[PDB]
């Protein structure tokens, strides 16, 4: 009920400590010079236990903490949106319907519309200007209400940069296409696709400037627009450009700094929580946290200190640099010798050393493609037969 | 709750004050919040979600799943430029890397000079202006191995300043005569 | 110290809130199916977050057993039968049970979550209606 008598009880226990029948024990200040300090010691030990519970049950941090570190907290999480590709992106068609027949129908429609999109890219202007708009595969997204078709496109030759603003007064052969995709009122292709899908349809032509930022566009461009440079033999200048598209980055250093940045992120969040655990809590008396099920420390601004959209989001993103690429030309790309030929151009590395020293773990797309790899084959026909361009790219 | 009419209008646009008010009057005080460890819903950083940030929120007027504009409300009509460029400095250069430039690409003598200055401290200006280059033999060399005939490019080159300095160098490459002669020129400059 | 962050924005950073059941009747049963547990659980959290604001007691994302379709196919276009390769498809199932809520509020919940459904998820809703033995249907 109240310690006013438990104090007397403990005094009797001290008397017993000396002897069971003695008046009192060795008392410098009547058992008050350091007995109170020892009482405070046990109270603060109880605070230690409750406090580490307090911090542990309120921890959530991105993965990437090097185990060698000491200040790293016990918590970890690899599923941060910025550090792993959602497995729904693995499949070109992203749908689930309780009606399997409808599911099959929809995948058929997706494939056919994708082929139509391919066929709908080539353009003519004046019978000696052939413009091909290379496009990746289509990412079909089937929500419960609307369908979305998303793809990355690369124009063969953007208007010259040195050219003046003259482009503002006419619409390019590609702008016309992208506008009729979804901007025309009662004529856009989305309206037509709505009949096949009985849903509201959307299309997103995301633009890409370089062909080597995507495996589909890169192989497509080599196999469709660069035939003359390898038909009778790979040109040395073409090989030089293809091999020096990207500089020689230090994968080890890149990975090490990424891991160190994650370490700093976690450690400074931990410090924020610790300073709220100690510096704060003064006015608010203890036991109001109710550590059994409640874990609210304080103001979210204080739990997340100096973590804005301006510093955190960009430095934790993964698959940002291209640190390796391989190109395989195979088939009858030679008038001489009338046989099969394989030529391999391999540059860089094909291993993400980020996963080798940190707690971030690789995930295999479709259970056979490492997350850091994107690859594609494209086959075309020349006067001698069919030939294949196979491209593999490693992103770190 | 935390703050009622505490200058909240100065910090949030008037259009959202109704939502904050409703939240205050529906979520009770002393709510026993708990962080989620199974699933993640909030960003790792801290944001009030009151401003649409380019490159981190969907661009208005452009089609995208999770959009709320109709087919007659899209305001994007040009596709000749990359929508939503990068934020901040607009570049993602790693630490200790430089944007590619001319770099003496017009003359491999500049690359040779830079490399030899790096390795042994000779004068790039002297190598690039006061040295003359001349191939002597450029021939194909073959090795027979388990896989088959592995052809190699062999070059020999004389480099001299026409005032007493002279040297020759041999270079062997597996891919191109240009790399062969580059190596040969490197070796010659070393062996002046 | 800094700009205030009200409860509405502070709630996003914590687990979704629930409203206790006061009677116990099951008005609706929403089963979410997908091949991607990530979107499945994210969308389930969104549902449990909207239910609180709309006043619908929702139980939570009960994980029902996952279903594994299996196929085996030869790896060669022509005769090589000693080598075969297996393919699988996992269906992940979550369940959210809605108790003690009016039909119109429940309607509007389902309508909003359909408005903002993610990609690769599917909803099966079982609605329960209490009725009297004899109904005047004229």
């Amino acid at each position: 009920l109240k310690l006013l008598n438990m104090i007397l009880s403990m005094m009797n226990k001290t008397n017993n400590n000396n002897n069971i029948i003695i008046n009192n024990t060795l008392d410098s200040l009547m058992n008050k010079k350091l007995l109170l300090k020892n009482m405070l010691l046990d109270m603060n030990n109880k605070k230690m236990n409750n406090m580490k519970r307090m911090l542990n049950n309120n921890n959530m941090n991105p993965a990437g903490a090097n185990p060698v570190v000491h200040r790293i907290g016990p918590a970890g999480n690899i599923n941060n949106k910025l550090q792993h590709l959602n497995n729904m992106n693995n499949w070109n068609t992203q749908i689930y319907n309780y009606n399997k027949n409808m599911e099959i129908m929809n995948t058929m429609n997706d494939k056919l519309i994708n082929k139509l999109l391919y066929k709908m890219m080539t353009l003519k202007l004046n019978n000696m200007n052939i413009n091909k708009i290379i496009m990746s595969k289509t990412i079909n997204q089937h929500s419960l209400n609307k369908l979305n078709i998303k793809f990355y496109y690369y124009n063969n030759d953007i208007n010259n940069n040195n050219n003046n603003n003259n482009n503002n007064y006419y619409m390019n052969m590609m702008n016309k296409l992208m506008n009729i995709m979804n901007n025309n009122m009662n004529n856009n292709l989305c309206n037509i696709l709505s009949y096949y899908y009985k849903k509201k349809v959307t299309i997103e032509p995301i633009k890409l400037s370089y062909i080597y930022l995507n495996s589909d566009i890169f192989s497509k461009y080599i196999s469709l627009n660069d035939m003359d440079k390898y038909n009778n033999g790979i040109l040395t200048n073409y090989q030089r450009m293809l091999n020096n598209i990207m500089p020689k980055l230090n994968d080890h250093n890149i990975s090490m700094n990424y891991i160190n940045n994650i370490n700093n992120i976690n450690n400074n969040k931990y410090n924020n929580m610790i300073n709220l655990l100690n510096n704060n809590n003064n006015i608010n008396n203890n036991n109001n946290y109710n550590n059994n099920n409640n874990n609210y420390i304080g103001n979210i601004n204080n739990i997340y200190n100096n973590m804005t959209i301006d510093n955190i989001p960009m430095d934790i993103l993964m698959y940002k640099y291209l640190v390796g690429w391989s190109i395989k030309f195979k088939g009858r790309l030679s008038n001489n010798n009338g046989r099969t030929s394989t030529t391999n151009l391999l540059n860089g590395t094909f291993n993400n050393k980020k996963y080798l020293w940190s707690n971030i773990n690789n995930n295999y797309k479709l259970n056979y493609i490492p997350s850091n790899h994107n690859l594609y084959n494209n086959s075309n026909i020349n006067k001698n037969g069919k030939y294949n361009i196979k491209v593999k790219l490693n992103f770190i | 709750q935390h703050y009622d009419e505490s200058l909240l209008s100065r910090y949030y646009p008037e259009s959202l004050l109704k939502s904050i008010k409703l939240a205050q009057q529906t979520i009770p005080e002393d709510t026993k919040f708990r962080v989620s460890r199974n699933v993640e819903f909030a960003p790792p950083y801290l944001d009030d979600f009151t401003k649409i940030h380019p490159f981190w929120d969907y661009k208005p007027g452009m089609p995208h799943l999770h959009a709320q504009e109709e087919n007659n409300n899209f305001s994007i009509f040009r596709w000749d430029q990359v929508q939503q460029p990068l934020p901040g400095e607009g570049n993602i250069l790693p630490p200790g890397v430089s944007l590619p430039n001319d770099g003496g690409r017009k003359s491999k003598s500049a690359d040779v000079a830079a490399g030899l200055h790096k390795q042994t401290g000779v004068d790039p200006d002297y190598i690039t202006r006061k040295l003359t280059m001349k191939p002597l033999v450029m021939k194909r060399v073959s090795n027979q191995t388990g896989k088959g005939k592995i052809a190699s490019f062999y070059a020999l080159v004389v480099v001299g300043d026409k005032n007493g300095m002279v040297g020759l160098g041999e270079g062997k490459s597996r891919e191109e005569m240009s790399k062969a002669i580059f190596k040969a020129h490197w070796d010659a400059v070393r062996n002046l | 110290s800094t700009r205030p962050y009200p409860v509405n924005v502070e709630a996003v950073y914590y687990a979704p809130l629930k409203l206790p059941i006061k009677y116990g009747d099951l008005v609706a049963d929403i089963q979410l199916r997908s091949y991607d547990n990530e979107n499945l659980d994210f969308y389930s959290d969104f549902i449990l977050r909207t239910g609180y604001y709309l006043g619908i007691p929702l139980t939570g994302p009960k994980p029902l057993p996952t279903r594994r379709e299996r196929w085996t196919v030869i790896k060669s276009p022509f005769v090589h039968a000693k080598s075969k390769e297996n393919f699988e498809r996992h269906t992940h199932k979550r369940l959210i049970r809605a108790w003690d809520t009016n039909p119109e509020v429940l309607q509007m919940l389902i309508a909003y979550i359909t408005k903002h459904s993610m990609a690769g998820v599917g909803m099966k809703c079982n609605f329960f209606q209490r009725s009297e033995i004899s109904l005047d249907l004229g």
Partner: peptide
């Protein structure tokens, strides 16, 4: 980096056409 956020409450009229079919 700043762009105004316009709001429109989800009225039942807006959520219409997405009520359960049965």
């Amino acid at each position: 980096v700043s762009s105004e956020y316009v709001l429109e409450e989800p009225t039942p009229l807006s959520l219409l056409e997405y009520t359960p079919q049965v």
